[PDB]
């Protein structure tokens, strides 16, 4: 019996929970069942089962993080006659500590529906072991070789182009004209032509980023609940694009406020450069730490601090009546007290001075010594919590970066395949030959 046409292998992928004994259970069942199916009806491929979502059992295993299934289903190796057309791994050369294994490469690069990499790297950040799933030998070495071969030429080139764009934007912004009421009529001097060119390039960059963000949001379809947990970088780039467009709209509307928009874009224009530090072995950690601290910490501490700030602010402002002249100024003053920059003068001529002093001393003790250092202790725990995972984290930062680039590929090339339509495998119940884009990989393990 089944629910939606699921095969027994499908139900077993669902049931498996990465326990060692359950792993052996499902592994042995898969071995026997696949052998029997190969012998009974060697007429068509059955692993590409359709479904309501079109999900294969290996695709489901990738989606749910059932690493135990992936460890075996992608590593079948057998030579028993009448069932030799379902093997995925082979061997050609062998030595004591080193073996030159031959791996099948289908369902990874070009499956046309949902490859293995296309699900592990695009998971919803609930899978407990997505950082380890890419450590399996075929995927790990494929990503390593794709990185070494051609990807770097595109990544470093992108980084250089972005840096040039930001330098040009900064230069154009610095030299804006001072007289009021835009738009301004250019003179025939060379400086005006350079400034106009800089502005045009800046707006072009802004428009480009806007459309890239639109495409990403339409294709990915975020949930609106995990919108900010993932896809942080696209959100920030898109926000920059919005600010730039608002700035140009105000510019052509004959208002002076466009500068107030522009500088905000300019600030992010530099800051988002930290994105490109992902993918470096060492310097990448200082990006992910900022992301975690700024999302999953301060959105909680915000309310706890704000209660204290607002309560004491209204207390002080209503106590003194006749520099604390308004609610805003007092909010700023107490904020300055919080971070140790403020000063306690105690000038004359306030009535109720003796109570004012007690309130301020209570506030300073409560906020500066007690609460703030509590926040610091929590952040210290957060950063120490991911000192050790840094290697595996970096691997994810590598992998996703590749998958966006090779998907885009920018030159109408088709060099993604590793090597060959190798016919040396050629196993099939028919008399014909076949290939699987096989990859020779040396494993040194003893």
């Amino acid at each position: 019996r089944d629910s939606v046409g699921n095969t027994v292998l499908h139900a077993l992928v669902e049931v498996a929970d990465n326990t060692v004994d359950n792993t052996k259970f499902v592994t042995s069942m898969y071995n026997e069942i696949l052998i029997l199916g190969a012998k009974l009806h060697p007429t068509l491929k059955l692993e590409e089962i359709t479904n309501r979502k079109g999900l294969t059992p290996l695709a489901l295993a990738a989606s749910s993080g059932k690493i135990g299934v992936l460890a075996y289903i992608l590593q079948r190796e057998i030579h028993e006659p009448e069932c030799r057309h379902l093997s995925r791994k082979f061997t050609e050369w062998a030595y004591g500590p080193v073996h030159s294994s031959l791996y099948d490469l289908s369902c990874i690069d070009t499956c046309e529906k949902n490859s293995v990499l296309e699900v592990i790297a695009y998971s919803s950040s609930e899978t407990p072991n997505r950082h380890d799933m890419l450590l399996v030998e075929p995927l790990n070495r494929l990503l390593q070789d794709k990185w070494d071969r051609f990807v770097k030429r595109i990544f470093y080139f992108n980084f250089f182009v972005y840096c040039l764009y930001m330098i040009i934007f900064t230069a154009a912004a610095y030299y804006r004209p001072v007289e009021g009421l835009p738009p301004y009529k250019l003179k025939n001097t060379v400086g005006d032509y350079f400034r106009v060119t800089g502005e045009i390039l800046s707006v072009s960059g802004g428009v480009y980023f806007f459309f890239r963000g639109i495409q990403y949001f339409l294709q990915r379809r975020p949930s609106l609940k995990s919108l900010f947990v993932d896809s942080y970088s696209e959100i920030l780039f898109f926000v920059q694009s919005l600010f730039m467009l608002v700035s140009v709209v105000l510019y052509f509307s004959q208002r002076k406020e466009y500068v107030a928009s522009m500088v905000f874009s300019l600030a992010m224009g530099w800051t988002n450069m930290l994105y490109y530090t992902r993918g470096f072995q060492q310097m990448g950690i200082y990006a992910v730490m900022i992301e975690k601290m700024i999302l999953r910490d301060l959105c909680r501490f915000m309310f706890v601090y704000l209660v204290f700030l607002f309560g004491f602010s209204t207390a002080v402002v209503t106590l003194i009546e006749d520099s604390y002249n308004s609610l805003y100024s007092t909010c700023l003053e107490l904020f300055k007290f919080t971070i140790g920059m403020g000063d306690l003068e105690f000038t004359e001529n306030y009535d109720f001075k003796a109570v004012f002093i007690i309130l301020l001393l209570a506030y300073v003790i409560l906020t500066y010594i007690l609460l703030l250092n509590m926040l610091i202790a929590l952040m210290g725990e957060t950063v120490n919590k991911i000192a050790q995972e840094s290697k595996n984290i970096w691997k994810l930062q590598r992998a996703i970066t590749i998958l966006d680039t090779e998907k885009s590929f920018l030159k109408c090339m088709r060099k993604a395949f590793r090597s060959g339509k190798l016919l040396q495998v050629g196993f099939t119940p028919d008399g014909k030959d076949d290939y699987r884009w096989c990859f020779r990989v040396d494993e040194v393990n003893w």
Binding site: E257, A260, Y328, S329, F346, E348, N349, D351, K353, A354
Partner: protein
Amino acid sequence: DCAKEGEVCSWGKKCCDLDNFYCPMEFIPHCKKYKPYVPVTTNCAKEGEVCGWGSKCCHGLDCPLAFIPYCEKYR
């Protein structure tokens, strides 16, 4: 050019005549004209009375800093 009295300053414009007008810090700065420094009115405390707990002292003397202050003429 600058903004006039009652107009919003500090978002794109400053107000003129700093000796006449100032732009307050309230997140919506409507600049306003100054006011004269009026002298101290009645109900100020006199010498020897407790000051700082319910009322300030008159302009002729100071209220020291202590837990229970008493005003004294400056000498």
